[PDB]
Amino acid sequence: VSQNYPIV
Amino acid sequence: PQITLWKRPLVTIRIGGQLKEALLNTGADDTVLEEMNLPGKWKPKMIGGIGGFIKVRQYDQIPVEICGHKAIGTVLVGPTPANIIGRNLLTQIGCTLNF
Amino acid sequence: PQITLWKRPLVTIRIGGQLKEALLNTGADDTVLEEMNLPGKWKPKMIGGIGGFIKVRQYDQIPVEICGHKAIGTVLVGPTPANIIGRNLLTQIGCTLNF
Numbered sequence: 001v002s003q004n005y006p007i008v
Numbered sequence: 009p010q011i012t013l014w015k016r017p018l019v020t021i022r023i024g025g026q027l028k029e030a031l032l033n034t035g036a037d038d039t040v041l042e043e044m045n046l047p048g049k050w051k052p053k054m055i056g057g058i059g060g061f062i063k064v065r066q067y068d069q070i071p072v073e074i075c076g077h078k079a080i081g082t083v084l085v086g087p088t089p090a091n092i093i094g095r096n097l098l099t100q101i102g103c104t105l106n107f
Numbered sequence: 108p109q110i111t112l113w114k115r116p117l118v119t120i121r122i123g124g125q126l127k128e129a130l131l132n133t134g135a136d137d138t139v140l141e142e143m144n145l146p147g148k149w150k151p152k153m154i155g156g157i158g159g160f161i162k163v164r165q166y167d168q169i170p171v172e173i174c175g176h177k178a179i180g181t182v183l184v185g186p187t188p189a190n191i192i193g194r195n196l197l198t199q200i201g202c203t204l205n206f
Binding site: 009010011012013014016017031032033034035036037040055056057058059060061062075077088089092095098099101102103104105106107 | 130134155157176187200201204
């Protein structure tokens with residue numbers, strides 16, 4: 001559920 | 009304006025003639041929007057993060073208005089689980105992090 | 108301090124007595140760090156990212172100093188592509204987005 005959006 | 013982080017920093021944006029809800033994301037340089045049928049040419053691209061990589065379509069020179077602040081640049085369209093506004097456009101609207 | 112977004116928002120943090128580099132991520136609900144050892148008990152958890160879902164170890168009430176600012180909260184450890192400081196801790200140091 002927890003959403004995390006880092007993008008390399 | 010000043011947006012706290014108690015909840016996801018969601019804002020309204022205008023793109024391709026549509027109004028959408030997007031998340032201000034300092035953790036990405038790119039801007040990624042949920043699948044939408046935008047006109048114009050594009051180039052294939054792969055982007056990665058937690059969970060791995062996904063395939064997206066890269067559109068250039070696309071006008072995007074964020075909470076009344078105009079911007080224009082590259083936008084990626086694909087199966088992202090959320091509309092993400094990256095640093096490429098955040099700098100254009102003069103957005104900073106402060107503490 | 109005020110941080111612009113032309114470059115990645117990288118900062119030095121201190122956790123478990125060790126110094127590390129992390130990315131201030133407003134697009135992350137939680138704080139996720141690359142594989143490491145942390146004292147105390149942890150619980151299995153699953154989180155989502157741009158590419159999908161991953162399994163992580165959840166450590167609660169962990170002290171973390173970010174750019175000289177103290178926070179004590181949840182820290183997730185798993186196969187993240189980079190150490191990130193999420194909203195759960197960003198709110199603790201009073202970080203906000205401004206434009």
